[PDB]
Amino acid sequence: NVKEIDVWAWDPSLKQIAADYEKKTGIKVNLKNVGTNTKEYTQLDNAIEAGSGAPDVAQIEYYALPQYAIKGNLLDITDKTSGYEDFYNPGPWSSVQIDGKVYALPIDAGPMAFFYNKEIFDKAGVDGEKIKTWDDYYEAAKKIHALGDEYYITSDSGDAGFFDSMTWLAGGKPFQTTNNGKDVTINLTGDNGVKEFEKFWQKLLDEKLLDTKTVGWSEDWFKGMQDGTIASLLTGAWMPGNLVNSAPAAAGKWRVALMPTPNGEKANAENGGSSLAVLKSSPKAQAAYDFIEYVAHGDGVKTHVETGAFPADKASLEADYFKNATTIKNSDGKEIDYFGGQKYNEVLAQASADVLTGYQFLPFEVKARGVFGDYLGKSYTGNQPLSEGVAAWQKALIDYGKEQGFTMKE
Ligand SMILES: OC[C@H]1O[C@@H](OC[C@H]2O[C@@H](O)[C@H](O)[C@@H](O)[C@H]2O)[C@H](O)[C@@H](O)[C@H]1O
């Protein structure tokens, strides 16, 4: 009797894929973007608490899945997924499993890449294809800002996910969980990758080379990408779909290169990457699962790549529509040549191959990333050393873990 489901998600391809699902099945998909990352999670937490108003399906990033799964908020879908290890790439598949059970299906992955506005870089005297090391990026940042006081190599108003990703990139692993999830060590204040990232970003902050006012996912963020005042992004491989749909005016001016690394070594991290989960509260579990399967495993997979997301599955990596992609279909189906003809998935596939293994999320990343700004904000809007904020963040996370029943060590 189910003729409609409710979905919360911000991935820009989901509107098209949901419309395609409606055409195929006759099931109405009531899709809402209720906020990006932590803004969505606040709303999901509120609906979970209230016992009412949750969607049947939500977009939940890999880093957030442990907290939701451990608390019993996601439906165990293990019995639907027999052959899925063979379908999905290993990182995404590992990330949807908590304590032996599958709680979501991967929909995209976020190996990082350096997206840059070639027009702005060239005008500033920077070769965006020659940014191999973090020092190269620092030197580029000075040249970009020399264009004028409003021009910055990128923006960072104080984002936890970026901090965590750059720690990973630099070889760090400040979070460890063992013993079926009961024993957690946090050593942000000692981890060498954290230290290396802090030293790098602290210099750019100190020299006022970053836009610390613009908040990610706001309109001014996309305006900056259009007008050149946010000249580049060190971010996940999902960015193309967002550039195409939300920064269309700069189409043709941007390019993709591999992430710069601390010393030019081959290394990468992931930033973001998402799954779709059925909420445990859903009275429409079968229809919710059927929708997720279409998006994440069936014909939605190809649509997702063609509309600018990076795949979570093995076959897409070998598919012609991935490897030989140049133009990206926007939300209206029009082919947009955002990267000026670049075979951008040649770079993104290499970016994925370069990701360092072994990194782990905390079992409470929704909490951890939600409070990052409480401890670190003054490092981005003020003079507080990053290292001081990180120490205060670690103490808060240890205390929270203990209060929630984890055995916490440093
Ligand atoms: O296409 C949208 C993608 O959105 C990503 O989520 C946003 C991203 O924001 C960053 O500022 C942050 O550092 C990072 O941790 C993420 O929260 C999703 O991760 C991605 O899968 C796409 O849906």
Q: What is the DSSP string of 113-159?
A: EEEEEHHHHHHHT--GGG--BHHHHHHHHHHHHTT-TT-BS-B-S--
Q: Indicate which technique resolved this structure.
A: X-ray
Residue type, position 292, single letter: I
The residue assigned the tokens 């229809």 is 287
Q: Are 191 and 213 in contact (CB under 8 A)?
A: no
How far is the C-alpha of 337 from the C-alpha of 324, rounded, in Å? 13
Q: Are 109 and 353 in contact (CB under 8 A)?
A: no
What is the secondary structure of 315-352 as a DSSP string? HHHH-HHHHT--SEE-TTS-EE-TTTT--HHHHHHHHH
Amino acid at 358: G
Half-sphere exposure of 44 (CA within 13 A, CB side): 35
Buried b (16+ CB within 10 A) or exposed e, 86-112: ebbbebbbebbbbeeebbbbbbbbbbb
Q: Would strands 28-32 and 4-8 be described as parallel, antiparallel, or unpaired?
A: parallel
Distance 191 CA to ligand 1 centre (A): 24
Q: How many CB atoms lie within 10 A of CB 51?
A: 8
Quick one: resolution in A?
Answer: 1.4
Angle at 387 between CA 221 and CA 381, to 5 degrees: 35
**DSSP label of 267:** -
Q: Which atom of ligand 1 is the closest one to the Cα of 37?
A: 17
Ligand 1 centroid to residue 38 C-alpha, Å: 10
Distances (CA, A) of 316 to 130, 196, 276, 307, 376: 29, 34, 18, 13, 39
Q: Which helix (H) or strand (E) holds 45?
A: helix 38-50
Q: Is 216 touching ligand 1 by the criterion CB < 6 Å?
A: yes
Q: What is the dihedral of CA 340, 345, 346, 347, to 10 degrees?
A: 80
Pocket test for ligand 1, best of 157, 274, 307 (most atoms within 8 A of CB): 274
Token pair, residue 321, equals: 């529509």
Residue to mutate (ligand 1; options 163, 244, 271, 369; most atoms within 8 A of CB): 271
Of 7, 10, 89, 155, best ligand 1 pocket probe by most atoms within 8 Å of the beta carbon: 10
User: Is any ligand 1 atom within 6 A of the Cβ of residue 155?
Assistant: no
Give the separation between CA 362 and CA 385, rounded to whole angstroms: 24
Bridge partners of 74? Answer: 279
13 labeled part of a ligand binding site: no
Q: What is the DSSP letter of 191?
A: -
Residue 214 CB–ligand 1 contact under 6 Å: no
Nearest to 78 by CA among 56, 62, 93, 58: 93
Closest CA to ligand 1's atom 11: 216
Contact 349, 310 (CB under 8 A): no
| DSSP 8-state secondary structure symbol assigned to residue 264 | S
Measured between alpha carbons, how far is 299 from 317 in angstroms, rounded to an integer? 15
Instruction: Say yes or no: CB of residue 159 within 6 Å of ligand 1.
Output: yes
Ligand 1 in contact with 274 (CB < 6 A)? yes
Closest to 33 measured CA to CA, from 22, 46, 25, 43: 43
Q: Whose structure tokens read 């030197």?
A: 139
The DSSP code for 51 is T
